Write a protein that binds this ligand. Sequence first.
Ligand code: CL
Length: 391
Amino acid sequence: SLDFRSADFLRTHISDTMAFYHPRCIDSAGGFFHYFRDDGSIYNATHRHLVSSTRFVFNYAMAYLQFGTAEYLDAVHHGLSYVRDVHRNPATGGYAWTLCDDRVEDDTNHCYGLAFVMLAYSCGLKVGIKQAREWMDETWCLLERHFWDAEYGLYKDEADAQWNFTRYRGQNANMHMCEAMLAAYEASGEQRYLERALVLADRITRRQAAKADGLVWEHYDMRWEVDWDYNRDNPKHLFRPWGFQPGHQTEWAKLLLILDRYIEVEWLVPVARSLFDVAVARSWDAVRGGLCYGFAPDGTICDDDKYFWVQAESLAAAALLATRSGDERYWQWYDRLWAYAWQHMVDHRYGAWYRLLDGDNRKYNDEKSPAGKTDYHTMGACHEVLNVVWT
Ligand SMILES: [Cl-]
């Protein structure tokens, strides 16, 4: 009976998750704490990760835009200071990947990191920080100088502190960069950002997908040919897992439908539908509920864990596909994804979502939000659905 498609539900859910993190995530000494137990207690106060530092700026910016709460605007400023004063290396323009007690632990320059930095700065401009328009331009320049490969229409992934790149090429940083470029466009109105987002979408969801039977594989060589073996022996790596990730197929479907809002071009929706339909067919657990984490190129599930962000990205995609297409089967997907998530993944005692469950929907431990997780994916999905329903 709960109406998962109502603004009432979505706004309340976002506010429940904000109540988990706020104000306990704020470190008055600098930035945010990045490791939280189920009950909100901090289990590692000293280790910090660029992906959390940036995602928490998104959390609070999108919440301020929705609710107007002054404490949330203050937290956007606090979070951006940490990104600019502690992560950022003024000598190179790069950003520390991880810190331990404000000392740089890993200074590797990850494109994935810069996507999140671009997103945090775009959020800063959206909340009225006019200086963020320049920080966005500085980040664009840094990306063009080192990461962009015009010949392929895609960014390289990973360089050391002197900008020496590895040969690895990855869809995931490009996917988040498409997302960041859309945010940058929404914040600044600059056409270059929207157009770069479109180029990235075309190259990944059409050209690269063609090499893997119509779905987006994660890992590639330096010539952007598929690397079928990368991390086969470390398949649960956090950013570079092995196998097709249904969550990334649906996340792309969402990004293509956001592009379709701003760009008039025929190919976006049919590609979005192909990615979403195949991904959920292959990965939905019809017995226990929920989308599984990974499947191999033969279709066989290779990781049946149920992750928070997979469900979230998929319901956001389903809502966008439903509204654009008028196909009610997409709202049925939306409803079943939420029914699963509400029953198993959302913590009704403390708020926010569990990170993952095993295939039997059991908890592994009490580490709700380790470094990298801020419920940016779950609140972000709700903010996105709020763009297509009456509020
Ligand atoms: Cl997250």
